[PDB]
Amino acid sequence: ALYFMGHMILVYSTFPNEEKALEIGRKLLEKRLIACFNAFEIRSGYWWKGEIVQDKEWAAIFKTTEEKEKELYEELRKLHPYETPAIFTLKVENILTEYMNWLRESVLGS
Template structure:
């Protein structure tokens, strides 16, 4: 299993992109959390509310998930972070059944 992490400007955009991933059966589950983000942009430090998405999928679907996020993401430079995850076998079996 892998986790894909990305951020969105608001819950509406996050839900829109994550629903696409779910509808296409590229992911099994998504967790969305609102948080404060501080970052450099165009020479100055910005501070905004964002929504972080923890996206759960399989290693085999990684490239398709990344491609779909890039195609639908509202940011010109979105973060797409991929992390390997060790999970219990029952969860991994479920994840493999609900994705294609």
């Protein structure tokens, strides 16, 4: 069909700056752990040492297959500059079939 459930996963994480986000995205592509990344600038807020702080970071969504999830989490844990980084996966319900094929081809290998 034009689209189907597929087996894509979307992993999200945030980084201290544009440079680090792009560098890690590139390293993940080199290892065929992701087929593509989309990064964007964000303003964040959270608790830190008893106070609410404002921060500027770069978020990134990583697109890959379910088969690469474990490896992706391990590589992100390896490369992340933060001690306790935000790393979580969102549920993908459907995906354009041709794109799913491209994702699969893009992550074939190591």
